[PDB]
Amino acid sequence: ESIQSRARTLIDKAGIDRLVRHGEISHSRWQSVRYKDIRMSTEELEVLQSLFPHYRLWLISGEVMPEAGQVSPDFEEASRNLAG
Amino acid sequence: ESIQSRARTLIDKAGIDRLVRHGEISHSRWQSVRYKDIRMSTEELEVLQSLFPHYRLWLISGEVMPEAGQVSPDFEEASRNLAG
């Protein structure tokens, strides 16, 4: 729905511990942007896009392009469900 | 090179007047994120990515995928120059 909401989905998917281990941003800052009604900055996106390169197009725009390796959590879940 | 710096490049490309007409963000807020040493939020990125869809992957990551339609201002300039 928004870049912010997609970013929050990825915070949950990674878990904040993994983000703290893979960037310079603190647990308290991650917790604040995840759960408090505050803006999320490009600094948080830096960590998320580096950790999830196959989610880059979706994170910034909500679009996917599977042929180019650009997918999303929901696309991957739908694929697994249809496979089952 | 950061998301913030690429975003500022696109602020200059569009011009703040045009950005104000294409989103809910104020002229003053655009001037602040462009010219003050403050963080830029995903709310500004919303306007930039919607206005520059061909620059989405580059905005979030610095990477291009020209075969997938994902380029950058500098890549287009290099293409213009090489074409000559």
Numbering used by the authors:
A (entry chain A), B (entry chain B): 2 to 85
What does the paper say about this structure?
Pf4 exists as a prophage in PAO1 and encodes a homologue of the P2 phage repressor C and was recently named Pf4r. X-ray crystal structure analysis shows that Pf4r forms symmetric homo-dimers homologous to the E.coli bacteriophage P2 RepC protein. Li et al. demonstrated that repressor C, which they named Pf4r, was responsible for immunity to Pf4 infection and also regulated replication of the Pf4 phage by repressing the expression of xisF4. Central to these effects of the Pf4 phage in P. aeruginosa is the repressor protein, Pf4r, which not only controls immunity to infection and phage replication but also acts to regulate the expression of host genes.
P. aeruginosa PAO1 carries two filamentous phage integrated into its genome, Pf4 and Pf6, found in tRNA genes at positions PA0729.1 and PA4673.1. We recombinantly over-expressed and purified Pf4r, Pf4r* (containing the mutations Ser4Pro and Arg80Leu) and a related repressor from the Pf6 phage (Pf6r), all with a C-terminal hexa-histidine tag for purification. Crystals of the related wild-type Pf6r (1.73 Å) (51% identity to Pf4r) had three complexes in the asymmetric unit cell; however, structural alignments of these complexes showed almost no differences between each other (pairwise structural alignments of the three complexes calculated by Super Pymol range between an RMSD of 0.235 and 0.266) and the DNA-binding helices have the same spacing as that of Pf4r* Type A and the P2-repressor C protein. Aligning the Pf4r* structure with the closely related wild-type Pf6r structure (bottom left), we can see that the proline mutation has not caused a large structural perturbation, i.e., the two structures (one wild type that dimerises and one being the mutant that does not dimerise in solution) (using SUPERPOSE v1.0) are remarkably similar (RMSD 0.518 for backbone atoms) while being only 49% identical at the sequence level. Therefore, to determine if Pf4r forms dimers and the effect of this mutation on protein dimerisation, we performed gel-filtration size exclusion chromatography (SEC) and multi-angle light scattering (MALS). This revealed that both Pf4r and Pf6r form dimers in biological buffers. As with Pf4, Pf6 also causes superinfection in P. aeruginosa but only from day 6 of biofilm growth. As for Pf4, we hypothesise that similar mechanisms of gene regulation are involved for Pf6.
